[PDB]
Amino acid sequence: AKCPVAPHGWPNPLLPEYDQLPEGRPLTQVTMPSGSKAWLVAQHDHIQRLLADNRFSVEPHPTFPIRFPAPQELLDMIARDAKNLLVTMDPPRHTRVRQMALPDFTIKAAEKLRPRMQDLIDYYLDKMEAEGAPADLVQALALPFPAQVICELAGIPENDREIFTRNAAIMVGTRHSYTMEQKLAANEELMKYFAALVTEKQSNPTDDMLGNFIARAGKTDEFDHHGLTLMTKMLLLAGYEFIVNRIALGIQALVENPEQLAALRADLPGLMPKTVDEVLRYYSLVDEIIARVALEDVEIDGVTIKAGEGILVLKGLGDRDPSKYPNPDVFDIHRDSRDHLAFGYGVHQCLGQHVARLMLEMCLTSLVERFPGLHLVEGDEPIELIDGLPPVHKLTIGW
Amino acid sequence: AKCPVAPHGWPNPLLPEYDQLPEGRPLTQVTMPSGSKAWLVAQHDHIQRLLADNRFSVEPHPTFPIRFPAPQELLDMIARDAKNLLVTMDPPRHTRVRQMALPDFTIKAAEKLRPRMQDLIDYYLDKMEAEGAPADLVQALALPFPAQVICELAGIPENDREIFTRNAAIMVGTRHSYTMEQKLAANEELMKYFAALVTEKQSNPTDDMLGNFIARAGKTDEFDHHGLTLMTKMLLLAGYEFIVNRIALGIQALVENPEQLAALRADLPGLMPKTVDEVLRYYSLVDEIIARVALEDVEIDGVTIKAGEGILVLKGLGDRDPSKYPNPDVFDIHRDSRDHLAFGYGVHQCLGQHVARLMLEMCLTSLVERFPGLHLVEGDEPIELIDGLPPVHKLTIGW
Numbered sequence: 162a163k164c165p166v167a168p169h170g171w172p173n174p175l176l177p178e179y180d181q182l183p184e185g186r187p188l189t190q191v192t193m194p195s196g197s198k199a200w201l202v203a204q205h206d207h208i209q210r211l212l213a214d215n216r217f218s219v220e221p222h223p224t225f226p227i228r229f230p231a232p233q234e235l236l237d238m239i240a241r242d243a244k245n246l247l248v249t250m251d252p253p254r255h256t257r258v259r260q261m262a263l264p265d266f267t268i269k270a271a272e273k274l275r276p277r278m279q280d281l282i283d284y285y286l287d288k289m290e291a292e293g294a295p296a297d298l299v300q301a302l303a304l305p306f307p308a309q310v311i312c313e314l315a316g317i318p319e320n321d322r323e324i325f326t327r328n329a330a331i332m333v334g335t336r337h338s339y340t341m342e343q344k345l346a347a348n349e350e351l352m353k354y355f356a357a358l359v360t361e362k363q364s365n366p367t368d369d370m371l372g373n374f375i376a377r378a379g380k381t382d383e384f385d386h387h388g389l390t391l392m393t394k395m396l397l398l399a400g401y402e403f404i405v406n407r408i409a410l411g412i413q414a415l416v417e418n419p420e421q422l423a424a425l426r427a428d429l430p431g432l433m434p435k436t437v438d439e440v441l442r443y444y445s446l447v448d449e450i451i452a453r454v455a456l457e458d459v460e461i462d463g464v465t466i467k468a469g470e471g472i473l474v475l476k477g478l479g480d481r482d483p484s485k486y487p488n489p490d491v492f493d494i495h496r497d498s499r500d501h502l503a504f505g506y507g508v509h510q511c512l513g514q515h516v517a518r519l520m521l522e523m524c525l526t527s528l529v530e531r532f533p534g535l536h537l538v539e540g541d542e543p544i545e546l547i548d549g550l551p552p553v554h555k556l557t558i559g560w
Numbered sequence: 561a562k563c564p565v566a567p568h569g570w571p572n573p574l575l576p577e578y579d580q581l582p583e584g585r586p587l588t589q590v591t592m593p594s595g596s597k598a599w600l601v602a603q604h605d606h607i608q609r610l611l612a613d614n615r616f617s618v619e620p621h622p623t624f625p626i627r628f629p630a631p632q633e634l635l636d637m638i639a640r641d642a643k644n645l646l647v648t649m650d651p652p653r654h655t656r657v658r659q660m661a662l663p664d665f666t667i668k669a670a671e672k673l674r675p676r677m678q679d680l681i682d683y684y685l686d687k688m689e690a691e692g693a694p695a696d697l698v699q700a701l702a703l704p705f706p707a708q709v710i711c712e713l714a715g716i717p718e719n720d721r722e723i724f725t726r727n728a729a730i731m732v733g734t735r736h737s738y739t740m741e742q743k744l745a746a747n748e749e750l751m752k753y754f755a756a757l758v759t760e761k762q763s764n765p766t767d768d769m770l771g772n773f774i775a776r777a778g779k780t781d782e783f784d785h786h787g788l789t790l791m792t793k794m795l796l797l798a799g800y801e802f803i804v805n806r807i808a809l810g811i812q813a814l815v816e817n818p819e820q821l822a823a824l825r826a827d828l829p830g831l832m833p834k835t836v837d838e839v840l841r842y843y844s845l846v847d848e849i850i851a852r853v854a855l856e857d858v859e860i861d862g863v864t865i866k867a868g869e870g871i872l873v874l875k876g877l878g879d880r881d882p883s884k885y886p887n888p889d890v891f892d893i894h895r896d897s898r899d900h901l902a903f904g905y906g907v908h909q910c911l912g913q914h915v916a917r918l919m920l921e922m923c924l925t926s927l928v929e930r931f932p933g934l935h936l937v938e939g940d941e942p943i944e945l946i947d948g949l950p951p952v953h954k955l956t957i958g959w
């Protein structure tokens with residue numbers, strides 16, 4: 162019947178880890194390239210219980226689970242900067258640093274962004290509608306719109322935006338869109354820009370997410386300038402790839418399920434929150450693993466995760482867990498998916514989740530309201546495959 | 561009870577082409593890296609109808625479907641030696657060259673090998689039982705036994721068989737067993753050995769498969785010495801990786817289905833033929849694509865495959881075709897699998913198929929009989945993963 166598969170047009174294979182579990186997806190111990198041990202965690206309940214457990218850590222550790230062999234020199238450089246990234250800090254330092262940004266990421270603070278966000282969307286759909294009737298939604302909305310929202314978060318003036326848009330789009334593209342050279346260079350330019358932006362917030366403070374974070378951090382001795390630059394990068398780019406893919410894949414799911422799209426448009430107030438939840442849950446399959454290391458022995462359902470052993474949270478499979486979501490591999494906006502794992506769980510659960518939800522909701526609502534004839538379209542020429550895969554993500558649509 | 565998935569322990573992902581088809585797996589046109597066009601062919605009926613058609617070609621062609629981007633010089637290299645490989649010859653020449661080896665590959669010819677094969681199997685199985693109950697069937701039998709059979713086919717004397725065996729193992733191992741530098745080393749070692757074996761049979765003829773073919777070839781002007789060397793590599797090594805893995809995959813399938821193992825042991829004469837068929841059919845999924853280019857337009861279903869265009873036959877999906885095999889993704893020795901596609905179809909259908917069938921049958925019969933307690937030794941120890949995959953082919957059994 163229905164199976165976990167990569168979405169149509171997806172330019173990556175699914176994570177091979179998904180194929181490494183017995184039937185029933187029990188906790189499965191594996192040996193990492195370094196000889197360290199980790200556990201594959203794919204059950205929705207196990208993921209929540211383990212990611213809420215204070216005995217697991219995100220910080221560098223001699224047996225932290227690392228999935229590929231890599232030169233230890235640059236392992237060491239990454240581990241040295243982990244203290245400057247919120248996602249690799251444990252509590253209680255994690256708690257204090259997260260609180261420096263948190264007031265600008267609440268539901269109500271995100272909501273304050275809605276009028277500007279609608280202007281951005283209205284802009285992109287005006288442009289899409291004014292040009293040719295067949296459009297690539299990845300290029301027309303999914304890539305550029307969140308970049309602009311990030312600039313609003315960072316108080317970046319409009320003159321500077323078009324060039325951060327350039328480098329952000331390079332970071333997030335496939336290997337067939339931008340070289341390993343153009344990327345590590347666009348990274349360098351972003352890091353230069355982020356350092357100059359931090360400096361600019363320290364003089365002349367501003368009332369935006371980044372400005373208020375920099376200000377709150379300055380009242381402590383928690384970061385030097387290099388640490389504020391890494392935090393700035395994380396706060397602005399940690400979610401870019403995710404939200405880009407969720408916008409395109411969400412619209413793809415709706416046009417691939419026209420009966421649900423028809424029902425959604427008839428009842429936007431009642432079905433849009435569920436639609437957002439279902440796009441979040443269903444496309445966790447194409448998201449990355451969430452990794453931790455145990456600091457103490459952890460017992461769960463008759464298995465012992467020993468201190469120093471990793472857990473590899475197969476987040477996408479947890480959101481396809483049949484005991485939590487009946488017929489889990491069917492996309493269905495009517496299901497109960499409120500408890501999804503797309504944002505993770507526990508203390509590191511996505512700081513940007515309310516900004517992210519609003520971006521996804523507002524994009525889906527606007528395309529659905531504005532294009533009652535919205536449908537999937539084949540395109541000029543047959544699908545390109547390189548090594549059997551689509552080289553870039555695109556979604557060709559008509560209306 | 562469905563979902564085509566990689567077998568447990570398989571060190572590669574499934575072919576990404578498998579994921580590029582619409583529901584129903586219709587004939588699906590794609591654009592290759594070079595810009596040429598090809599068709600994805602996954603329906604059992606279509607595969608037979610297209611591979612039967614003499615309008616398709618295996619010979620170099622400006623728009624032959626090539627799945628990866630490639631230097632033209634290395635295309636050139638492959639192209640100028642396609643005259644020397646049966647697998648890249650079209651009829652009429654393909655028919656005449658194949659006749660030079662066919663007599664030693666018939667059902668009757670293969671059956672002549674059964675006495676020697678049984679002594680080979682008994683040797684490896686003695687050595688395995690003696691060496692201790694937890695054994696890796698890949699090392700113990702699946703790799704070396706078919707290498708020996710090839711030695712018997714080529715008339716390779718016993719004093720050379722240890723080196724030939726380890727070199728064959730090198731070329732079929734994953735990138736983690738052996739290096740690409742370590743592999744090309746064994747390639748030219750084997751190509752030197754094959755060119756010396758050609759010379760030896762030209763001066764001291766023999767009645768083995770390879771000797772007969774060299775003699776029959778010498779009665780014509782078809783090959784120079786380099787040609788006979790290439791042909792010798794193909795006739796000896798074309799199926800080695802396939803039969804190695806089928807032996808191991810077949811034992812895994814039987815143990816993973818104890819009720820079918822039990823019925824096989826109770827009725828070996830009636831059920832072993834069907835077991836071989838189903839091991840061939842079911843594991844086509846992990847075999848390679850079959851490719852052709854059209855030399856004229858070919859109409860099928862509703863589609864016209866135009867003269868410049870390729871077909872990429874998704875042989876393994878064809879053997880999972882639901883309209884040909886009910887519940888196709890269930891391994892079931894009791895089903896009708898006689899029409900399977902594992903050996904291909906049409907003029908190029910596997911030359912070694914009868915030797916391959918006998919090797920597989922004899923191995924399964926001897927293992928199943930000799931070790932009543934036969935089971936898999938897995939689930940208790942951590943599996944090694946590199947980049948999320950089993951690093952090497954391995955099948956740990958016990959009895």
Ligand code: HEM
Nearest residue numbers: 247248399400403404407451503504505509511512513517
């Ligand atoms: C659909 C969109 C998004 C998804 C699916 C997503 C997913 C996630 C996940 C799974 C985590 C937890 C990783 C872990 O526990 O190791 C996380 C953390 C985080 N996300 Fe997002 N994210 C999204 C959008 C965003 C956006 C738009 C932003 C910022 C503008 C953002 C900022 C962050 C930050 C700063 C963290 C670190 C939180 C911490 O360590 O306390 N994310 N995200």
Ligand code: HEM
Nearest residue numbers: 646647798799802803806850902903904908910911912916
């Ligand atoms: C389970 C075992 C095997 C499988 C699944 C298999 C599969 C195949 C397939 C699918 C083809 C056709 C390729 C195409 O049409 O492009 C083929 C051809 C061929 N096979 Fe096998 N093979 C196996 C064993 C062997 C063995 C043991 C040998 C040699 C002793 C062998 C030698 C050949 C040769 C020489 C060809 C080329 C025939 C031609 O082009 O006319 N194969 N095989």
